[PDB]
Amino acid sequence: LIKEDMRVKVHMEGNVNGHAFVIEGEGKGKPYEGTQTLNLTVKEGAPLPFSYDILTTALNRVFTKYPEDIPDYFKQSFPEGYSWERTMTYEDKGICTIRSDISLEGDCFFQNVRFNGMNFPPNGPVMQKKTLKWEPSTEKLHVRDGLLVGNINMALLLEGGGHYLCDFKTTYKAKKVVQLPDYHFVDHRIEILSNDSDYNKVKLYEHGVARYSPLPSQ
Amino acid sequence: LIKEDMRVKVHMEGNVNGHAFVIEGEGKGKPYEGTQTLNLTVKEGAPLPFSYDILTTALNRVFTKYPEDIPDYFKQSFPEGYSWERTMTYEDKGICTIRSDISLEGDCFFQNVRFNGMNFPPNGPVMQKKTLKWEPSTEKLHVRDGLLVGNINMALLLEGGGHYLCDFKTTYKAKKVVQLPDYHFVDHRIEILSNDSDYNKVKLYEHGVARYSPLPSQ
Amino acid sequence: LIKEDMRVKVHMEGNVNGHAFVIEGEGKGKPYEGTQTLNLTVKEGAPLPFSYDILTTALNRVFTKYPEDIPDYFKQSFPEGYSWERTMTYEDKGICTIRSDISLEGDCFFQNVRFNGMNFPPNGPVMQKKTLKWEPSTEKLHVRDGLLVGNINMALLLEGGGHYLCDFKTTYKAKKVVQLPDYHFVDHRIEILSNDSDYNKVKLYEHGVARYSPLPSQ
Amino acid sequence: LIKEDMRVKVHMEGNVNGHAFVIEGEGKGKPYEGTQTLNLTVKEGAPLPFSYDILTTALNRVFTKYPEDIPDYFKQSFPEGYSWERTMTYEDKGICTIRSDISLEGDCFFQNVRFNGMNFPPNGPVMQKKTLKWEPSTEKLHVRDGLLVGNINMALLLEGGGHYLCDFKTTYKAKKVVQLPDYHFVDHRIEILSNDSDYNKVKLYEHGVARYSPLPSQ
């Protein structure tokens, strides 16, 4: 069962372009409002030689405000929970493969993540740390082989203006049989609120809202 | 100048998996409300042996409702007008390349379209006409090298359920200096209203509304 | 019937990055040795404002040396002949879509080609005529849905050294049911032998040989 | 220094579709003939719930027959050794991300491999163990930014005929400055010689020979 208030614990082990790191996060959030706050410490491989932004979207879709007219795959999936696998394909041919396991114990979700980035241009914006933020997005989700699949045309705002684009592919896998939703959208905004200079401590925010098209069928 | 009521003429010369066609349209629209309808006659290639859906997004973003806080790339471009180039990339590895030129004489927008589609599996949804409709969508639009570029995750709803995915990339090119918008989103719904069973005659409708994130910054 | 010696006529209508063109071609070759020569005249849109190398591979696998034990898809297809569709995807996101209809009247093959290119960066290798030649190549051919399909990792050698890569995908389609080959390979070399400085007049040569792996199976 | 006979030790940590595994290889090979064998034992995660064939090509290019006219990038890298990064991108949108380190102690090459596979369809041929073998291949190698890069059009033969395509991209990184080869080819054949039906015990063979085009220039 999910309360209007909930706690989040995150562990991430990763390698990006040969560099190894660990990240731990203590957080809270409001699942039914689609909002969450997360306090992240770089535990190993400080200082990071790449943009913290690439990591943020691997740092739960339980925290999405779902209209009643659209079945909530992620919330239904508990107490057993769900896992997801993501492919982040950037335009400079940098690739990240990410796997998260989402388990519940009491007031606290536990997020267990594996981050693999490689083939990022060394003089490119991720390894040169020129990303300011992710642009807010719209995930498209549908059913493929009894699973939920999300697709997002994503964009990072660069220092000096312009965008660096990433194609976002997630397969969400519930551990119990759940009621499948039809083709819907989720509006996101991912925001780093505070950080230190090495991004050794970061505070992260996420707002997610499930919807149908606002435009009338005919 | 663009009135509240404007007329639309459309010429399409096209080729899908070897088959050559010409489709003529007469239509009308409300540019500032972001809605329009088009009456489509197949002049050559009747009957068509592939889903009409693949042609529909090619059959003018002037018919996009633009809020005052976002500059309108498409309306500013007139009187000289604009052009666009598009790649549609399907999951079965069918592919379309499209080029459109948008002129304005008096109240009428003329659209000249060259449509190419190939490597569509012959037992694939498109050549078997097993596509019911396009899902509603959300195009993300950024400025790259002074031009406006859109990316859309798109899905066709098939018989038996299931969706058939496509990656939309558009490059829009004003034939004039115009004020350039910040990163923004256009929500879309395209639908076929009426058709004979050969789709030789089709009535097409589109609704398009531009916006920033509905979710607020923190 | 295909003789040791045959003639080749070539009509290509095209458009690259907005620039239209027409290229006529009379030529000859030895089908059973997989060698041929072609004399190429630019007839419209001279001089071409882009590298001629993109076009050359679109200017007939009938000129392939086929060992006894691999069926010859192309040669079998005649008299009725065959057609092909090709995708050229360049690493800088230039994209060419090409169709060729291959017919036989007497001892002369007619090749009717439609060539479409778009999204070549204006400062890019293709639009800045900075390519020397195609590296020789190995095509891989497999049967998919009762058609023959080819994939080639191709490279254009650049002025100043280094390579500009391009993923090659051809779908060949005989107009007759022919005996389908097993998975096999075609070794390629294509060469511009002679040209004037605007490439308005080009002499083109290709050598193609089909084989299995030379490596013994354990 | 490499001798006509050398030994191989392999430690692969891996996760495919969430299922983790460890494999230990002991094997031998003949570096200047391009031939090698391996004895593979699944030490964790037996039985593997996916096709073994996807793991086989990550289980040295030191064991490649290199002519004198083509510099040997991999044999020059020792005594210090080389690392490699690979992308395997399947047509069903399955993806593997691999990384290897090659060390030499005495007469034995130590290969340390990390394997990540994900978004493999659950009814797909990988997850349904329906892959008979890798077809023989021809890799194409060029220098990009003072590193050697490999591209292969790879196919798995499918039980019930037909093929399952993969795009291989490998970036090899010598840990010492070496002589850089010109654009060349390496012909490959990988073959599982013997296996228990669960594949917990597997014997592996690979042949690899470097060449130029066998077709004369003009």
Author numbering:
A (entry chain C), B (entry chain D), C (entry chain A), D (entry chain B): 3 to 61, 65 to 223
Quoted passage from the original study:
The DendFP from Dendronephthya sp is a member of the Kaede-like group of photoconvertible fluorescent proteins. This FP is irreversibly converted from a green to red fluorescent state following irradiation with light from the UV region of the spectrum. The excitation/emission maxima of the green and red state of DendFP are 492/508 and 555/575 nm, respectively. The spectroscopic analysis showed that Fe2+, Fe3+, and Cu2+ significantly reduced the fluorescence emission of DendFP.
